[PDB]
Amino acid sequence: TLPHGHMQTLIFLDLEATGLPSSRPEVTELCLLAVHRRALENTSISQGHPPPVPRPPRVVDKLSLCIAPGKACSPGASEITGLSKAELEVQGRQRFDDNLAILLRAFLQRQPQPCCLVAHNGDRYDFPLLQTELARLSTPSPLDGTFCVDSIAALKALEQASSNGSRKSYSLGSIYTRLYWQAPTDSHTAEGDVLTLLSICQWKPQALLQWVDEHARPFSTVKPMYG
Amino acid sequence: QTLPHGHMQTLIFLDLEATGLPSSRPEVTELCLLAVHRRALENTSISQGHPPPVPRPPRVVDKLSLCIAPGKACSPGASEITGLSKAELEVQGRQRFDDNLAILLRAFLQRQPQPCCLVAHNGDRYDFPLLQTELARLSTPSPLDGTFCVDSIAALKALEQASSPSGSRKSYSLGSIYTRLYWQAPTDSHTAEGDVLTLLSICQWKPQALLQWVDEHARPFSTVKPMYG
Ligand SMILES: Nc1ncnc2c1ncn2[C@@H]1O[C@H](COP(=O)(O)O)[C@@H](O)[C@H]1O
Ligand SMILES: Nc1ncnc2c1ncn2[C@@H]1O[C@H](COP(=O)(O)O)[C@@H](O)[C@H]1O
Ligand SMILES: [Mg+2]
Ligand SMILES: [Mg+2]
Ligand SMILES: [Mg+2]
Ligand SMILES: [Mg+2]
Ligand code: NA
Ligand code: NA
Ligand code: NA
């Protein structure tokens, strides 16, 4: 039996930030895309080889926010994301603050529970970093009742256990292009990367949901990236 | 040269889908807000060529798009053009327009620099009065009581008439304007996010004149009369 029941809402998540973990980075952009499990189960199943890119579900909740960091972006981060401290501050973006936590809470509370965050490389990056950002706030984390999984492990199972010990790349773009023979769009933007992740999770939608139900773990158990 | 409420620092392009036309007493089924700082509009390339290319949206934007379970069914035409129905919103677990949505909207708005102005196509007769009606049902105070609002139909009418002198009858539907300016068909029409992006594009056509028109005509959302009781 499933450890936490059937997930009713999948929230595809991506973050951009000031740099890589050893720089103690800060979030500069956040996108959440909430999809009911029934929207995934209604995705058309693949049309041969290569299949077409699935279309996103009609009924979706989307939140995309730009966030001013308290430190400069690494050159490598600015180079790929198109974001910098100057871009964000000149356009009046606010810091990762209590009000943001409230916004996230109200967004989550509009989704049927339980919810599971899905992020590519989430276990090593997105989830620990979000935990760090939320832990330094006064508002309690709005995610302590939410679950999470890493889509890297999900797509590894769906690819390996369904079709050669050869290693495959599991970067977000490599997966997308391997499945659909097509280049992702708007790479290294929070929203663009979330839509790419949604497309690869729509590849085998019922298999993905089952794997998520089986591997969802509480977000509260995620260790912060740094203190 | 003396503005009514100062320079608008944030423009929030806004669109709603709903269950039908005003005579049906509609309820909102989808809401999208796209918040753009005024400097992103100041730094938009002006349109030259024929047709001009569709402007690039700003890199830095805040976006909120939410589907909402209505208390009444969509009209057949409304359901077809929007791709939404009451039954499907309910099986996908969408919640009604409620207090928590007002809290979400409030927190979203507070992340934007003030003063802040909603921009909606046909907002003065439809979106703003309908939102006022929806918010009036709630126990929470309106999260829009300090926000301003303008209708982009009037804006584009002013902008287009200034760009070709008088003395015919043109449609000012969202799609007609877009296709007139850019010789392109809009994408994702009659979806809240799609129409908000199309609205952004027409507002970027003459972005300095749009900002000036908005500064001159912004009025408090609190003054909007509800569509119905
Ligand atoms: N080469 C890189 N140099 C610096 N930061 C990077 C690099 N690759 C990824 N990142 C960081 O990781 C964040 C998330 O990556 P992604 O979701 O793949 O765009 C980015 O916003 C950057 O802060
Ligand atoms: N041609 C139309 N026929 C019926 N209803 C419409 C029509 N245009 C707009 N509406 C209604 O008004 C709402 C807002 O219009 P729009 O933003 O142009 O999609 C829609 O969701 C429908 O409920
Ligand atoms: Mg990522
Ligand atoms: Mg990314
Ligand atoms: Mg509209
Ligand atoms: Mg619309
Ligand atoms: Na923080
Ligand atoms: Na499947
Ligand atoms: Na202009």
Descriptive overview:
Chain B: Mg(2+) 2 binds at residue 15. Two copies of one chain form a homodimer. Chain A has one domain: Ribonuclease H-like superfamily/Ribonuclease H (Nucleotidyltransferase, domain 5, 2-Layer Sandwich), CATH 3.30.420.10. Chain A has helices spanning 37-41, 75-81, 85-90, 98-109, 122-135, 151-160, 172-180, 190-201, 205-215, and strands at 9-17, 27-36, 61-66, 115-119, 147-150, 217-218. Chain A has 227 residues and is an alpha/beta fold. Chain A contains nine helices and six strands, in the order ββαβαααβαβααααβ. In chain A, 38% of the residues lie in helices and 16% in strands. The radius of gyration of chain A is 17 Å and the shape is globular. In chain A, helix 6 packs across helix 9 and helix 7 crosses helix 8 (190-201). At the A-B interface, strand 3, helix 3 and helix 4 of A face strand 3, helix 3 and helix 4 of B. One sodium ion (NA) binds at residues 204-207 of chain A.
